[PDB]
């Protein structure tokens, strides 16, 4: 029903000279784009990844991201110079940006930044800010980032206008792959376990039944991905009943 669009950026700064930035883009649990440090251009991972943008609109946007990648890299390096010797390499920076699409024309946009695997900064409203628990030395980098009115105006435009616009088109163009059903296949095993693989979408029901009565003991594992964009699940502890949207009332009972 509700799809979260996220551009996930991974930037590593080993030392003063070495750095790489790699990004992946998701619409729900489906990868739509990949942008490797090695590549000058953003790659589509779905036939519908350009959404409803024109080739010219896609190109203008890509050009912006290309300038951003080179500029962000130098800005982090200059911020490390500014903070020395307090903060030094190796440095890991993760950026999560995108928007959630709700019923109607409702949307909520986000831009969260993690430093050394800890969420410290977000872009909120018209400027950058630190979040509760962030170290106080980040106030000088935030002051400097907020001095850049040009980047702030661009970010506001991307979050408030571009992200919702793009994702509405993406949801249209990708409707068939997002609303696709894939039947789960289940098998039992136990060593001194209910394996369920190949289902899509992610929402599933897996339970250990003593006839009609359920068992409180049964431990549903984490959702493990398959390389063909389907899911894998385990249920540990007599019959294994699995209920999925693809089965349409015909539940799987494995004794």
């Amino acid at each position, epitope marked *: 029903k509700n799809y979260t669009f996220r551009c996930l950026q991974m930037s590593s700064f080993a030392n003063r000279s070495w750095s790489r930035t790699d990004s992946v883009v998701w619409l729900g649990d489906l990868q739509t784009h990949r942008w490797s440090n090695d590549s000058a251009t953003i790659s589509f991972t779905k036939p519908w990844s350009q959404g409803k943008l024109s080739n010219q609109q896609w190109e203008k946007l890509q050009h912006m991201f290309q300038v951003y990648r080179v500029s962000f890299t130098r*800005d982090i390096q*200059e*911020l490390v110079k*500014m903070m020395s010797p307090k903060e030094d390499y190796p440095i890991e920076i993760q950026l999560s940006a995108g928007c959630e699409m709700y019923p109607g024309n409702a949307s909520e946009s986000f831009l969260h930044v993690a430093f050394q695997g800890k969420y410290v900064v977000r872009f909120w409203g018209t400027s950058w800010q630190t979040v509760p628990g962030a170290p106080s030395w980040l106030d000088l980098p935030i002051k*400097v980032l907020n*001095a*850049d009115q*040009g980047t702030s105006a661009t970010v506001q435009m991307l979050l408030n206008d571009t992200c919702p616009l793009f994702v509405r088109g993406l949801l249209e163009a990708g409707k068939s792959d997002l609303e696709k059903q894939e039947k789960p296949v289940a098998w039992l095993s136990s060593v001194p376990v209910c394996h369920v693989s190949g289902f899509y979408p992610k929402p599933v029901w897996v339970m250990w039944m003593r006839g009609d009565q359920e068992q409180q003991g049964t431990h549903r594992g984490d959702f493990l991905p398959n390389a063909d964009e389907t899911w894998y699940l385990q249920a540990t502890l007599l019959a294994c009943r699995v209920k999925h949207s693809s089965l349409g009332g015909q539940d799987i009972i494995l004794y």
Partner: T-cell receptor
Amino acid sequence: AAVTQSPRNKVAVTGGKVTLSCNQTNNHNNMYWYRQDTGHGLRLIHYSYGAGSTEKGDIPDGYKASRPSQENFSLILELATPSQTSVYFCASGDEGYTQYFGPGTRLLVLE
Amino acid sequence: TQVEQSPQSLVVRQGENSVLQCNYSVTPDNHLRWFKQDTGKGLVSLTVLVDQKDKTSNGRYSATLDKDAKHSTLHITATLLDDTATYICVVGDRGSALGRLHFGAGTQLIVIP
């Protein structure tokens, strides 16, 4: 927002030590050293993001920088060469893109 | 160099207008500043241009900026003897102290009194 430099002109000898000083009372964290030569625009030698910090610019070779305090930023020429005959400019700024330039220092390095 | 100025030098008579050009390849181009430098003296800011298509005015000085064309023009209306100086074009690649200034080599203007 003003920047002062000392001395205004300086005559030094090859292999001698030259210290060009720059002072600002604007409480600016960032300070920059440039040299101006005919046929060229100003070129960044060294800069500083605060007291204790020095960063290499585009053309650092032959120069050493010292930021002993927020106010003072020095350009040290340990072994003056005649190629270092130039006009040296100092600038300062806060978190903004504006750099406030100093009046200059004409250095002449003789044999 | 990433910043080129034209003409290299020019001679005008008092009361005449001077038109000075700047072209750059600096990426990104946050802002463009024009400086006036008198012989022996330092740099005095004449104007800053910040928008995609910008126009500024400061008395007898006026300027334009077209970030798409990566070009700027400085106009001196009714030049005076005191306008004898070097006019320097500078492109800043960030809207904060994180930026580097890219300097043009200047245009020498001589005004005949």
